[PDB]
Amino acid sequence: EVVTVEHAMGKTEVPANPKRVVILTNEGTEALLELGVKPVGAVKSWTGDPWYPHIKDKMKDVKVVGDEGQVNVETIASLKPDLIIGNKMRHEKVYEQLKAIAPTVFSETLRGEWKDNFKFYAKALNKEKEGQKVVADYESRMKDLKGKLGDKVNQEISMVRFMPGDVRIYHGDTFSGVILKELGFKRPGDQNKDDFAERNVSKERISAMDGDVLFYFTFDKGNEKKGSELEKEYINDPLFKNLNAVKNGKAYKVDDVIWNTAGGVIAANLLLDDIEKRFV
């Protein structure tokens, strides 16, 4: 009937064979799908209507239970789940409300932890063996790519994000950070740090964006397109145009969804594919 799972908010008995699972992160949604569990409810994709294209078909008739930052507890209760999976960084405040509905287990954070989070979700679902195969398959595809890249990994890759009111330079404890590191890519300067990002990068700090290759991506909250507005301002600034990466023709806009925001094992595989497309 049950198994005990240690997690970010304690120790909880969960079904040995969960039948009606609700999943409260985008990255966790991908874990479930790859582990052969279709959730009865899930938070909408950050920039989907409601689902990212890469999971849309797999999410047919899944009930939207809010978004990752603001979950709808009433909708979750209505689904009568036997297991709820969330994340302490996103959902700590609603943990007790979720626990009142069904056994609830939390991962700790997002940042660069996608692979450990995936393994945790596999444990929570009692699908460790299945999870080992998914991880092994990803690592094999990763090894395939390392071979195809050869010494192209010796390039310093710079990661820049435009968001509403905030230009960021992404560092090591991030989705792109840990995957670039696993592949063996170098990073320039502070992008080697094991923190999340340099935040609120000014036009004066544009020099900190340089590298051998510069990948930038943009997040827009809504129809205001405030992220894209900031991108336009920065990439047309003379300081940006004088970056070595830009003068070399090696500054590229990449997809926010697969390079950062989806954040799960399906996206990780799509990121490998995109890197192969761009470098090989």
PDB file of C-alpha atoms in Angstrom:
ATOM      1  CA  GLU A   1       0.000   0.000   0.000  1.00  0.00           C
ATOM      2  CA  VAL A   2       2.641   2.594   1.035  1.00  0.00           C
ATOM      3  CA  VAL A   3       6.318   3.588   1.012  1.00  0.00           C
ATOM      4  CA  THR A   4       8.104   6.189   3.172  1.00  0.00           C
ATOM      5  CA  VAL A   5       9.725   9.091   1.324  1.00  0.00           C
ATOM      6  CA  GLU A   6      12.178  11.543   2.902  1.00  0.00           C
ATOM      7  CA  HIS A   7      11.816  14.973   1.287  1.00  0.00           C
ATOM      8  CA  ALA A   8      12.347  18.725   1.751  1.00  0.00           C
ATOM      9  CA  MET A   9       9.409  19.177   4.167  1.00  0.00           C
ATOM     10  CA  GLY A  10       9.789  15.982   6.225  1.00  0.00           C
ATOM     11  CA  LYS A  11       9.083  12.258   6.010  1.00  0.00           C
ATOM     12  CA  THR A  12       5.831  11.096   4.403  1.00  0.00           C
ATOM     13  CA  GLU A  13       4.051   7.849   3.536  1.00  0.00           C
ATOM     14  CA  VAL A  14       3.117   7.830  -0.160  1.00  0.00           C
ATOM     15  CA  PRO A  15       1.304   5.204  -2.241  1.00  0.00           C
ATOM     16  CA  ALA A  16       3.515   2.373  -3.497  1.00  0.00           C
ATOM     17  CA  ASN A  17       1.628   2.731  -6.806  1.00  0.00           C
ATOM     18  CA  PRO A  18       0.298   6.288  -7.229  1.00  0.00           C
ATOM     19  CA  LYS A  19      -2.704   6.570  -9.597  1.00  0.00           C
ATOM     20  CA  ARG A  20      -3.706  10.245  -9.454  1.00  0.00           C
ATOM     21  CA  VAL A  21      -0.659  12.496  -9.196  1.00  0.00           C
ATOM     22  CA  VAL A  22      -0.622  16.306  -9.165  1.00  0.00           C
ATOM     23  CA  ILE A  23       2.683  17.946 -10.113  1.00  0.00           C
ATOM     24  CA  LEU A  24       3.487  21.561  -9.256  1.00  0.00           C
ATOM     25  CA  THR A  25       6.645  22.376 -11.250  1.00  0.00           C
ATOM     26  CA  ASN A  26       7.364  22.459 -14.972  1.00  0.00           C
ATOM     27  CA  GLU A  27      10.551  20.437 -14.485  1.00  0.00           C
ATOM     28  CA  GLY A  28       8.703  17.830 -12.403  1.00  0.00           C
ATOM     29  CA  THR A  29       6.011  17.503 -15.067  1.00  0.00           C
ATOM     30  CA  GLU A  30       8.703  16.323 -17.487  1.00  0.00           C
ATOM     31  CA  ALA A  31      10.008  13.824 -14.916  1.00  0.00           C
ATOM     32  CA  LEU A  32       6.554  12.252 -14.543  1.00  0.00           C
ATOM     33  CA  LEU A  33       6.051  11.981 -18.296  1.00  0.00           C
ATOM     34  CA  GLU A  34       9.431  10.274 -18.735  1.00  0.00           C
ATOM     35  CA  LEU A  35       8.671   7.930 -15.825  1.00  0.00           C
ATOM     36  CA  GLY A  36       5.401   6.827 -17.515  1.00  0.00           C
ATOM     37  CA  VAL A  37       3.091   8.716 -15.180  1.00  0.00           C
ATOM     38  CA  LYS A  38       0.511  11.046 -16.684  1.00  0.00           C
ATOM     39  CA  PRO A  39      -0.532  13.538 -14.002  1.00  0.00           C
ATOM     40  CA  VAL A  40      -4.218  14.238 -13.377  1.00  0.00           C
ATOM     41  CA  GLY A  41      -3.268  17.862 -12.695  1.00  0.00           C
ATOM     42  CA  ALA A  42      -0.264  20.064 -13.386  1.00  0.00           C
ATOM     43  CA  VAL A  43       0.752  23.710 -13.169  1.00  0.00           C
ATOM     44  CA  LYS A  44       0.705  25.393 -16.562  1.00  0.00           C
ATOM     45  CA  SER A  45       3.951  25.848 -18.456  1.00  0.00           C
ATOM     46  CA  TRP A  46       5.482  29.266 -17.748  1.00  0.00           C
ATOM     47  CA  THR A  47       5.094  30.350 -21.388  1.00  0.00           C
ATOM     48  CA  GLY A  48       2.544  27.917 -22.861  1.00  0.00           C
ATOM     49  CA  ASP A  49      -1.205  28.124 -23.524  1.00  0.00           C
ATOM     50  CA  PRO A  50      -1.224  26.168 -21.318  1.00  0.00           C
ATOM     51  CA  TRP A  51       1.587  23.734 -22.277  1.00  0.00           C
ATOM     52  CA  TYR A  52       5.020  24.096 -23.840  1.00  0.00           C
ATOM     53  CA  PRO A  53       5.016  22.719 -27.393  1.00  0.00           C
ATOM     54  CA  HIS A  54       7.442  19.927 -26.403  1.00  0.00           C
ATOM     55  CA  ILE A  55       4.932  18.425 -23.904  1.00  0.00           C
ATOM     56  CA  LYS A  56       1.584  19.583 -25.353  1.00  0.00           C
ATOM     57  CA  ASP A  57       0.536  16.274 -26.944  1.00  0.00           C
ATOM     58  CA  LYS A  58       1.529  14.293 -23.828  1.00  0.00           C
ATOM     59  CA  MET A  59      -0.583  16.589 -21.596  1.00  0.00           C
ATOM     60  CA  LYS A  60      -3.927  16.052 -23.376  1.00  0.00           C
ATOM     61  CA  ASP A  61      -6.798  16.502 -20.893  1.00  0.00           C
ATOM     62  CA  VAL A  62      -4.481  17.173 -17.929  1.00  0.00           C
ATOM     63  CA  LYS A  63      -6.163  19.688 -15.610  1.00  0.00           C
ATOM     64  CA  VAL A  64      -4.328  22.994 -15.125  1.00  0.00           C
ATOM     65  CA  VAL A  65      -3.943  23.670 -11.382  1.00  0.00           C
ATOM     66  CA  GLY A  66      -2.577  27.220 -11.606  1.00  0.00           C
ATOM     67  CA  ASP A  67       0.996  28.216 -12.350  1.00  0.00           C
ATOM     68  CA  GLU A  68       4.233  27.138 -10.713  1.00  0.00           C
ATOM     69  CA  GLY A  69       4.433  30.279  -8.550  1.00  0.00           C
ATOM     70  CA  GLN A  70       0.736  30.373  -7.587  1.00  0.00           C
ATOM     71  CA  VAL A  71      -1.018  27.004  -7.351  1.00  0.00           C
ATOM     72  CA  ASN A  72      -4.812  26.669  -7.138  1.00  0.00           C
ATOM     73  CA  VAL A  73      -5.399  24.533  -4.048  1.00  0.00           C
ATOM     74  CA  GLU A  74      -9.170  24.311  -4.678  1.00  0.00           C
ATOM     75  CA  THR A  75      -8.619  22.832  -8.143  1.00  0.00           C
ATOM     76  CA  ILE A  76      -6.085  20.377  -6.697  1.00  0.00           C
ATOM     77  CA  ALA A  77      -8.562  19.260  -4.017  1.00  0.00           C
ATOM     78  CA  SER A  78     -11.216  18.710  -6.719  1.00  0.00           C
ATOM     79  CA  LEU A  79      -8.942  16.238  -8.543  1.00  0.00           C
ATOM     80  CA  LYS A  80      -8.798  13.927  -5.491  1.00  0.00           C
ATOM     81  CA  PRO A  81      -5.110  13.132  -5.953  1.00  0.00           C
ATOM     82  CA  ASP A  82      -3.371  10.323  -4.075  1.00  0.00           C
ATOM     83  CA  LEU A  83      -0.011  12.135  -4.326  1.00  0.00           C
ATOM     84  CA  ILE A  84       1.046  15.772  -4.697  1.00  0.00           C
ATOM     85  CA  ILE A  85       4.601  16.666  -5.722  1.00  0.00           C
ATOM     86  CA  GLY A  86       5.970  20.186  -5.327  1.00  0.00           C
ATOM     87  CA  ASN A  87       9.061  22.205  -4.524  1.00  0.00           C
ATOM     88  CA  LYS A  88      10.028  23.941  -1.277  1.00  0.00           C
ATOM     89  CA  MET A  89      11.495  27.022  -2.958  1.00  0.00           C
ATOM     90  CA  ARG A  90       8.229  27.602  -4.872  1.00  0.00           C
ATOM     91  CA  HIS A  91       5.594  26.146  -2.553  1.00  0.00           C
ATOM     92  CA  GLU A  92       6.711  26.111   1.102  1.00  0.00           C
ATOM     93  CA  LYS A  93       3.834  28.415   2.141  1.00  0.00           C
ATOM     94  CA  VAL A  94       1.126  26.057   0.804  1.00  0.00           C
ATOM     95  CA  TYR A  95       2.675  22.762   2.017  1.00  0.00           C
ATOM     96  CA  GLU A  96       0.214  22.314   4.906  1.00  0.00           C
ATOM     97  CA  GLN A  97      -2.763  23.054   2.622  1.00  0.00           C
ATOM     98  CA  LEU A  98      -1.532  20.419   0.156  1.00  0.00           C
ATOM     99  CA  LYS A  99      -0.871  17.872   2.927  1.00  0.00           C
ATOM    100  CA  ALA A 100      -4.511  18.299   3.990  1.00  0.00           C
ATOM    101  CA  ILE A 101      -5.588  17.064   0.521  1.00  0.00           C
ATOM    102  CA  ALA A 102      -3.153  14.178  -0.031  1.00  0.00           C
ATOM    103  CA  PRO A 103       0.331  12.863   0.757  1.00  0.00           C
ATOM    104  CA  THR A 104       2.662  15.642  -0.411  1.00  0.00           C
ATOM    105  CA  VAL A 105       6.417  15.484  -1.074  1.00  0.00           C
ATOM    106  CA  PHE A 106       8.718  18.388  -2.013  1.00  0.00           C
ATOM    107  CA  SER A 107      12.039  18.730  -3.784  1.00  0.00           C
ATOM    108  CA  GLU A 108      14.240  21.466  -2.276  1.00  0.00           C
ATOM    109  CA  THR A 109      15.016  23.952  -5.036  1.00  0.00           C
ATOM    110  CA  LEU A 110      15.528  24.445  -8.775  1.00  0.00           C
ATOM    111  CA  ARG A 111      18.790  26.233  -9.696  1.00  0.00           C
ATOM    112  CA  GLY A 112      21.217  23.571 -11.047  1.00  0.00           C
ATOM    113  CA  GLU A 113      19.473  20.602  -9.410  1.00  0.00           C
ATOM    114  CA  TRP A 114      17.388  19.180 -12.292  1.00  0.00           C
ATOM    115  CA  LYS A 115      19.084  15.756 -12.310  1.00  0.00           C
ATOM    116  CA  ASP A 116      18.887  15.195  -8.543  1.00  0.00           C
ATOM    117  CA  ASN A 117      15.295  16.479  -8.646  1.00  0.00           C
ATOM    118  CA  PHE A 118      14.491  13.971 -11.382  1.00  0.00           C
ATOM    119  CA  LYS A 119      15.971  11.125  -9.291  1.00  0.00           C
ATOM    120  CA  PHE A 120      13.934  12.338  -6.296  1.00  0.00           C
ATOM    121  CA  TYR A 121      10.689  12.325  -8.310  1.00  0.00           C
ATOM    122  CA  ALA A 122      11.500   8.781  -9.460  1.00  0.00           C
ATOM    123  CA  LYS A 123      11.861   7.777  -5.787  1.00  0.00           C
ATOM    124  CA  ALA A 124       8.620   9.580  -4.841  1.00  0.00           C
ATOM    125  CA  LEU A 125       6.740   7.680  -7.566  1.00  0.00           C
ATOM    126  CA  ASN A 126       8.390   4.350  -6.630  1.00  0.00           C
ATOM    127  CA  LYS A 127       9.962   4.197 -10.107  1.00  0.00           C
ATOM    128  CA  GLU A 128      13.679   4.221  -9.223  1.00  0.00           C
ATOM    129  CA  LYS A 129      14.553   1.512 -11.729  1.00  0.00           C
ATOM    130  CA  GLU A 130      12.733   3.381 -14.505  1.00  0.00           C
ATOM    131  CA  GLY A 131      14.506   6.605 -13.465  1.00  0.00           C
ATOM    132  CA  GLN A 132      17.905   4.916 -13.650  1.00  0.00           C
ATOM    133  CA  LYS A 133      17.191   4.085 -17.305  1.00  0.00           C
ATOM    134  CA  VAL A 134      16.099   7.655 -18.120  1.00  0.00           C
ATOM    135  CA  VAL A 135      19.270   9.050 -16.507  1.00  0.00           C
ATOM    136  CA  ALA A 136      21.487   6.458 -18.233  1.00  0.00           C
ATOM    137  CA  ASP A 137      19.926   7.342 -21.590  1.00  0.00           C
ATOM    138  CA  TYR A 138      20.481  11.082 -21.053  1.00  0.00           C
ATOM    139  CA  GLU A 139      24.103  10.501 -20.014  1.00  0.00           C
ATOM    140  CA  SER A 140      24.682   8.343 -23.109  1.00  0.00           C
ATOM    141  CA  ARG A 141      23.326  11.094 -25.385  1.00  0.00           C
ATOM    142  CA  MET A 142      25.493  13.548 -23.473  1.00  0.00           C
ATOM    143  CA  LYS A 143      28.563  11.350 -24.109  1.00  0.00           C
ATOM    144  CA  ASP A 144      27.611  11.098 -27.805  1.00  0.00           C
ATOM    145  CA  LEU A 145      27.597  14.888 -28.013  1.00  0.00           C
ATOM    146  CA  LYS A 146      30.904  15.283 -26.142  1.00  0.00           C
ATOM    147  CA  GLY A 147      32.498  13.118 -28.838  1.00  0.00           C
ATOM    148  CA  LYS A 148      30.994  15.126 -31.697  1.00  0.00           C
ATOM    149  CA  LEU A 149      32.044  18.446 -30.123  1.00  0.00           C
ATOM    150  CA  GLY A 150      35.678  17.458 -29.579  1.00  0.00           C
ATOM    151  CA  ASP A 151      37.763  20.494 -28.620  1.00  0.00           C
ATOM    152  CA  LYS A 152      34.916  22.939 -29.384  1.00  0.00           C
ATOM    153  CA  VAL A 153      34.194  22.626 -25.638  1.00  0.00           C
ATOM    154  CA  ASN A 154      37.353  24.657 -24.944  1.00  0.00           C
ATOM    155  CA  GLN A 155      35.383  27.782 -25.915  1.00  0.00           C
ATOM    156  CA  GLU A 156      34.168  30.078 -23.135  1.00  0.00           C
ATOM    157  CA  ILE A 157      30.368  30.213 -23.379  1.00  0.00           C
ATOM    158  CA  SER A 158      28.532  33.263 -22.049  1.00  0.00           C
ATOM    159  CA  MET A 159      24.855  33.005 -21.003  1.00  0.00           C
ATOM    160  CA  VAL A 160      22.761  36.204 -20.830  1.00  0.00           C
ATOM    161  CA  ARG A 161      19.046  36.561 -20.064  1.00  0.00           C
ATOM    162  CA  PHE A 162      16.711  39.492 -20.701  1.00  0.00           C
ATOM    163  CA  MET A 163      13.690  39.594 -18.387  1.00  0.00           C
ATOM    164  CA  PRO A 164      11.292  42.379 -17.449  1.00  0.00           C
ATOM    165  CA  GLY A 165      13.377  44.977 -15.579  1.00  0.00           C
ATOM    166  CA  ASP A 166      16.337  42.615 -15.121  1.00  0.00           C
ATOM    167  CA  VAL A 167      19.243  41.659 -17.370  1.00  0.00           C
ATOM    168  CA  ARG A 168      21.011  38.615 -15.914  1.00  0.00           C
ATOM    169  CA  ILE A 169      24.250  36.780 -16.600  1.00  0.00           C
ATOM    170  CA  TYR A 170      23.732  33.132 -15.680  1.00  0.00           C
ATOM    171  CA  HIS A 171      26.361  31.275 -13.616  1.00  0.00           C
ATOM    172  CA  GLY A 172      27.019  27.619 -12.662  1.00  0.00           C
ATOM    173  CA  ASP A 173      24.112  26.719 -10.344  1.00  0.00           C
ATOM    174  CA  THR A 174      21.596  26.888 -13.184  1.00  0.00           C
ATOM    175  CA  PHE A 175      20.032  24.603 -15.787  1.00  0.00           C
ATOM    176  CA  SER A 176      22.302  25.786 -18.619  1.00  0.00           C
ATOM    177  CA  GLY A 177      25.220  26.016 -16.162  1.00  0.00           C
ATOM    178  CA  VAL A 178      25.216  22.388 -15.057  1.00  0.00           C
ATOM    179  CA  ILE A 179      24.586  20.994 -18.562  1.00  0.00           C
ATOM    180  CA  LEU A 180      27.345  23.129 -20.127  1.00  0.00           C
ATOM    181  CA  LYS A 181      29.652  21.974 -17.306  1.00  0.00           C
ATOM    182  CA  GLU A 182      28.745  18.292 -17.814  1.00  0.00           C
ATOM    183  CA  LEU A 183      29.559  18.617 -21.534  1.00  0.00           C
ATOM    184  CA  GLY A 184      32.911  20.184 -20.586  1.00  0.00           C
ATOM    185  CA  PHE A 185      32.389  23.725 -21.916  1.00  0.00           C
ATOM    186  CA  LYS A 186      34.368  26.568 -20.393  1.00  0.00           C
ATOM    187  CA  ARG A 187      32.840  29.810 -19.088  1.00  0.00           C
ATOM    188  CA  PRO A 188      34.288  33.328 -18.806  1.00  0.00           C
ATOM    189  CA  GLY A 189      35.200  34.798 -15.402  1.00  0.00           C
ATOM    190  CA  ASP A 190      32.347  34.991 -12.888  1.00  0.00           C
ATOM    191  CA  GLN A 191      30.218  32.598 -14.960  1.00  0.00           C
ATOM    192  CA  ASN A 192      32.391  29.827 -13.454  1.00  0.00           C
ATOM    193  CA  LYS A 193      30.987  30.584  -9.982  1.00  0.00           C
ATOM    194  CA  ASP A 194      28.703  28.061  -8.284  1.00  0.00           C
ATOM    195  CA  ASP A 195      25.976  30.665  -7.634  1.00  0.00           C
ATOM    196  CA  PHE A 196      22.866  31.423  -9.703  1.00  0.00           C
ATOM    197  CA  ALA A 197      23.366  34.673 -11.642  1.00  0.00           C
ATOM    198  CA  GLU A 198      24.619  38.226 -11.732  1.00  0.00           C
ATOM    199  CA  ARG A 199      21.436  40.275 -11.487  1.00  0.00           C
ATOM    200  CA  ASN A 200      20.368  43.700 -12.758  1.00  0.00           C
ATOM    201  CA  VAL A 201      23.278  43.982 -15.174  1.00  0.00           C
ATOM    202  CA  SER A 202      23.637  47.611 -16.264  1.00  0.00           C
ATOM    203  CA  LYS A 203      24.628  48.877 -19.701  1.00  0.00           C
ATOM    204  CA  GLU A 204      28.007  49.670 -18.088  1.00  0.00           C
ATOM    205  CA  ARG A 205      28.444  45.963 -17.184  1.00  0.00           C
ATOM    206  CA  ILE A 206      27.811  44.790 -20.789  1.00  0.00           C
ATOM    207  CA  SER A 207      31.544  43.978 -21.036  1.00  0.00           C
ATOM    208  CA  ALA A 208      30.884  41.184 -18.478  1.00  0.00           C
ATOM    209  CA  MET A 209      28.756  39.465 -21.160  1.00  0.00           C
ATOM    210  CA  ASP A 210      31.693  38.695 -23.450  1.00  0.00           C
ATOM    211  CA  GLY A 211      32.939  35.220 -24.279  1.00  0.00           C
ATOM    212  CA  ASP A 212      34.005  33.128 -27.251  1.00  0.00           C
ATOM    213  CA  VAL A 213      30.301  32.432 -27.852  1.00  0.00           C
ATOM    214  CA  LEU A 214      27.423  34.455 -26.392  1.00  0.00           C
ATOM    215  CA  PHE A 215      23.986  32.868 -26.068  1.00  0.00           C
ATOM    216  CA  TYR A 216      21.213  35.205 -24.970  1.00  0.00           C
ATOM    217  CA  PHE A 217      17.597  34.355 -24.222  1.00  0.00           C
ATOM    218  CA  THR A 218      14.541  36.374 -23.343  1.00  0.00           C
ATOM    219  CA  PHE A 219      11.594  35.914 -21.031  1.00  0.00           C
ATOM    220  CA  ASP A 220       8.376  37.865 -21.529  1.00  0.00           C
ATOM    221  CA  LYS A 221       5.704  37.763 -18.813  1.00  0.00           C
ATOM    222  CA  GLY A 222       2.859  38.844 -21.113  1.00  0.00           C
ATOM    223  CA  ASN A 223       1.747  40.959 -24.076  1.00  0.00           C
ATOM    224  CA  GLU A 224       3.819  43.894 -22.730  1.00  0.00           C
ATOM    225  CA  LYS A 225       6.969  42.077 -23.953  1.00  0.00           C
ATOM    226  CA  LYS A 226       9.142  43.906 -21.410  1.00  0.00           C
ATOM    227  CA  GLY A 227      11.915  41.292 -21.692  1.00  0.00           C
ATOM    228  CA  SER A 228      12.102  41.780 -25.463  1.00  0.00           C
ATOM    229  CA  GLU A 229      12.130  45.555 -24.939  1.00  0.00           C
ATOM    230  CA  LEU A 230      15.216  45.220 -22.735  1.00  0.00           C
ATOM    231  CA  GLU A 231      16.902  42.840 -25.213  1.00  0.00           C
ATOM    232  CA  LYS A 232      16.409  45.390 -28.003  1.00  0.00           C
ATOM    233  CA  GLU A 233      17.886  48.181 -25.881  1.00  0.00           C
ATOM    234  CA  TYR A 234      20.965  46.163 -24.912  1.00  0.00           C
ATOM    235  CA  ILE A 235      21.838  44.333 -28.146  1.00  0.00           C
ATOM    236  CA  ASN A 236      21.703  47.601 -30.123  1.00  0.00           C
ATOM    237  CA  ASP A 237      23.910  49.434 -27.588  1.00  0.00           C
ATOM    238  CA  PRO A 238      27.397  50.259 -28.938  1.00  0.00           C
ATOM    239  CA  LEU A 239      28.973  48.441 -25.957  1.00  0.00           C
ATOM    240  CA  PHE A 240      27.203  45.218 -26.974  1.00  0.00           C
ATOM    241  CA  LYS A 241      28.079  45.680 -30.643  1.00  0.00           C
ATOM    242  CA  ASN A 242      31.755  46.020 -29.612  1.00  0.00           C
ATOM    243  CA  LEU A 243      31.836  42.693 -27.718  1.00  0.00           C
ATOM    244  CA  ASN A 244      34.343  40.229 -29.182  1.00  0.00           C
ATOM    245  CA  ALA A 245      31.659  37.530 -29.406  1.00  0.00           C
ATOM    246  CA  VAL A 246      29.428  39.905 -31.392  1.00  0.00           C
ATOM    247  CA  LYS A 247      32.184  41.115 -33.756  1.00  0.00           C
ATOM    248  CA  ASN A 248      33.049  37.442 -34.384  1.00  0.00           C
ATOM    249  CA  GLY A 249      29.422  36.730 -35.359  1.00  0.00           C
ATOM    250  CA  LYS A 250      29.117  34.324 -32.428  1.00  0.00           C
ATOM    251  CA  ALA A 251      26.318  35.994 -30.479  1.00  0.00           C
ATOM    252  CA  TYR A 252      23.036  34.120 -30.905  1.00  0.00           C
ATOM    253  CA  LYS A 253      19.527  34.288 -29.510  1.00  0.00           C
ATOM    254  CA  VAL A 254      18.523  30.905 -28.054  1.00  0.00           C
ATOM    255  CA  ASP A 255      15.178  29.532 -26.855  1.00  0.00           C
ATOM    256  CA  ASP A 256      14.403  30.503 -23.240  1.00  0.00           C
ATOM    257  CA  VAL A 257      12.188  27.423 -22.826  1.00  0.00           C
ATOM    258  CA  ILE A 258      14.760  24.712 -23.558  1.00  0.00           C
ATOM    259  CA  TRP A 259      17.833  26.636 -22.318  1.00  0.00           C
ATOM    260  CA  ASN A 260      16.336  27.474 -18.907  1.00  0.00           C
ATOM    261  CA  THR A 261      12.673  27.689 -18.113  1.00  0.00           C
ATOM    262  CA  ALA A 262      11.165  24.232 -18.701  1.00  0.00           C
ATOM    263  CA  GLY A 263      14.037  22.873 -16.623  1.00  0.00           C
ATOM    264  CA  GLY A 264      13.364  19.131 -16.750  1.00  0.00           C
ATOM    265  CA  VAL A 265      14.785  15.979 -18.270  1.00  0.00           C
ATOM    266  CA  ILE A 266      12.897  16.377 -21.576  1.00  0.00           C
ATOM    267  CA  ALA A 267      14.252  19.921 -21.953  1.00  0.00           C
ATOM    268  CA  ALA A 268      17.743  18.680 -20.988  1.00  0.00           C
ATOM    269  CA  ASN A 269      17.649  16.283 -23.927  1.00  0.00           C
ATOM    270  CA  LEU A 270      16.357  19.048 -26.227  1.00  0.00           C
ATOM    271  CA  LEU A 271      19.191  21.304 -25.030  1.00  0.00           C
ATOM    272  CA  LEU A 272      21.747  18.615 -25.983  1.00  0.00           C
ATOM    273  CA  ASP A 273      20.079  18.520 -29.417  1.00  0.00           C
ATOM    274  CA  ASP A 274      20.222  22.314 -29.758  1.00  0.00           C
ATOM    275  CA  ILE A 275      23.900  22.423 -28.799  1.00  0.00           C
ATOM    276  CA  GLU A 276      24.589  19.701 -31.380  1.00  0.00           C
ATOM    277  CA  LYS A 277      22.672  21.714 -33.998  1.00  0.00           C
ATOM    278  CA  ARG A 278      24.583  24.907 -33.211  1.00  0.00           C
ATOM    279  CA  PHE A 279      28.121  23.485 -32.909  1.00  0.00           C
ATOM    280  CA  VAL A 280      28.314  20.288 -35.001  1.00  0.00           C
TER     281      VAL A 280
END
